[PDB]
Amino acid sequence: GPAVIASIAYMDPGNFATNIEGGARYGYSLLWVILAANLMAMVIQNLSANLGIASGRNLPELIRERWPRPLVWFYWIQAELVAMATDLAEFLGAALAIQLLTGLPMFWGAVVTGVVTFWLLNLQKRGTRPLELAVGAFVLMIGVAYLVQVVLARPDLAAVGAGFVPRLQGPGSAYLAVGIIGATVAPHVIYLHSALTQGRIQTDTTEEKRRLVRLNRVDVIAAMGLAGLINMSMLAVAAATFHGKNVENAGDLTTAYQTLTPLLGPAASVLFAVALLASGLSSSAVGTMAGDVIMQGFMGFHIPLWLRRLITMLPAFIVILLGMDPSSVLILSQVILCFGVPFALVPLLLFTARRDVMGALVTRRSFTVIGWVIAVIIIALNGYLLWELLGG
Ligand SMILES: CCCCCCCC/C=C/CCCCCCCC(=O)OC[C@H](O)CO
Ligand SMILES: CCCCCCCC/C=C/CCCCCCCC(=O)OC[C@H](O)CO
Ligand SMILES: CCCCCCCC/C=C\CCCCCCCC(=O)OC[C@H](O)CO
Ligand SMILES: CCCCCCCC/C=C\CCCCCCCC(=O)OC[C@H](O)CO
Ligand SMILES: CCCCCCCC/C=C\CCCCCCCC(=O)OC[C@H](O)CO
Ligand SMILES: CCCCCCCC/C=C\CCCCCCCC(=O)OC[C@H](O)CO
Ligand SMILES: CCCCCCCC/C=C\CCCCCCCC(=O)OC[C@H](O)CO
Ligand SMILES: CCCCCCCC/C=C\CCCCCCCC(=O)OC[C@H](O)CO
Ligand SMILES: CCCCCCCC/C=C\CCCCCCCC(=O)OC[C@H](O)CO
Ligand SMILES: [Cl-]
Ligand SMILES: [Cl-]
Ligand SMILES: [Mn+2]
Ligand SMILES: [Mn+2]
């Protein structure tokens, strides 16, 4: 199912870190963030998909051919920082799941992750098909587990209802709300989702274009709606499990399995870690593939795929060697990703409103306004958080 495959692709280790920590530390009060970020991602990914259908090119390619060279260089560098921050959460989340399963130190967990990710890149498309379905089964069923657990946990519905009213409770809640937006509105997909759509036309004609826009819109919203229900459920179960109970290391990903213990029993620790590992390995390989496509779109050339894989591993090993907490840096990476969202939105909103780019598929003037409002909101939230990190 198209809703199933995309919800699994969007459930990266960054979502696990932000949902568990969000519910455990702030209860249900951040449910409106997940709902809002999911609705924003619906509009943004629809524009990114409609850009590839109408133009036949991805967003990095259109920037390379239309904007002045120094601006293309700056946009390539910031998209490369998005690449490292995206891979940092996924590569480390897999290494963390290795520790949750085997007990190896985080350094060796990254070594095992590095060997698997290096080997996973050499595989062809026909060899990874059973693996893409395998990782999907693990992540999907864990998502359904939280959907069932959010009912069985009997959440305080008075607190659940109030959590959908936007309330930012200081700087700490703004830090985690920004991380949830970055974990939902993935800037790496903003550049990439155009490349998945480019060429999806069977044969060039306006009729086929409006057909694929119709199909993509239904599939994206259905998947996002499912991913949003799972994310809200995982945060709500984390709130019912830890919030207010003063549990040692609550919100951390090493104790997140306790959210599914009343449903899974002794299997909650293995099933959660296996899902965290599968979510980390698949998203780290896809992101590495996407980063290479993004560089070719911006610069017309790329570095060897093994070299890109080696460079993205360096921040993960350094964080491990520094003794930093894995769950905390996963959240930090999503916060940095949220600062890359407005940079990706500006060319997206500008290109999807041009006839020489979209042809007959120019975005409705209303949705262009909504897209700019989303950009101003995320800029304000990123500015609101970055303000209190300097004092205010
Ligand atoms: C591929 C799927 C199967 C997974 C197998 C990975 C394949 C590559 C393993 C390389 C060595 C990593 C194995 C662990 C490192 C060996 C040394 C070790 O175990 O060290 C433990 C000690 O506690 C530390 O001080
Ligand atoms: C917090 C902010 C609230 C967010 C509000 C949520 C609105 C729900 C929108 C869902 C998908 C929107 C799809 C928009 C598709 C626009 C396509 C268009 O305008 O036509 C162009 C042509 O069809 C091809 O490019
Ligand atoms: C935090 C976001 C990412 C941080 C990014 C920081 C670096 C910005 C990139 C290049 C410097 C400005 C462009 C100059 C280098 C591009 C070479 C070029 O094509 O143009 C040269 C000159 O600027 C023609 O006027
Ligand atoms: C299109 C049909 C209407 C959409 C159906 C939902 C009804 C609420 C309206 C918009 C949702 C977003 C706004 C809801 C949040 C209240 C307004 C707000 O943002 O302020 C926050 C809070 O009230 C400060 O204390
Ligand atoms: C491509 C990005 C565009 C570049 C443009 C701006 C870049 C700034 C990025 C991140 C600043 C935020 C750093 C967050 C560091 C906060 C450390 C922390 O742990 O915060 C704790 C929180 O206050 C309670 O838990
Ligand atoms: C068909 C295959 C289906 C079965 C496959 C999954 C079954 C998992 C079985 C044993 C869990 C091994 C872990 C030992 C018990 C863990 C329960 C627990 O309390 O967790 C402690 C935690 O590891 C401390 O941090
Ligand atoms: C991160 C700072 C710079 C890191 C860079 C130094 C690390 C090199 C060490 C081991 C990798 C060696 C991999 C060898 C792969 C062989 C592929 C080859 O033949 O190289 C030609 C070209 O790279 C493609 O065709
Ligand atoms: C704190 C609140 C934010 C503070 C920071 C302010 C940033 C505001 C960003 C966008 C405003 C609306 C911009 C709408 C631009 C529309 C441009 C357009 O439609 O086409 C013109 C294009 O430049 C032809 O090449
Ligand atoms: C890198 C991606 C993000 C770019 C980062 C841009 C940072 C600065 C932009 C906007 C400032 C944020 C404005 C926050 C809104 C609060 C300011 C305000 O209006 O104060 C309220 C009232 O005036 C007092 O009583
Ligand atoms: Cl242009
Ligand atoms: Cl409460
Ligand atoms: Mn994500
Ligand atoms: Mn930890």
Residue numbers in the entry: 45 to 436
Text lifted from the article:
In addition to the physiological substrates Fe2+ and Mn2+, Nramps can also transport toxic metals like Cd2+ and Hg2+ but exclude the abundant alkaline earth metals like Mg2+ and Ca2+.
Two more waters, one bound to Q378 and another from the inner vestibule, complete a seven-coordination sphere resembling a pentagonal bipyramidal geometry with substantial distortion. However, in M230A•Mn2+ H232 flips to interact with the G330 carbonyl (TM8), suggesting that it may transiently move during the conformational cycle. Mn2+ is present at the external site in the inward-open M230A•Mn2+, and consistently, the ITC data fit a two-site model (Kd1=215±65 µM assigned to the orthosteric site, Kd2=4600±1300 µM for the external site).
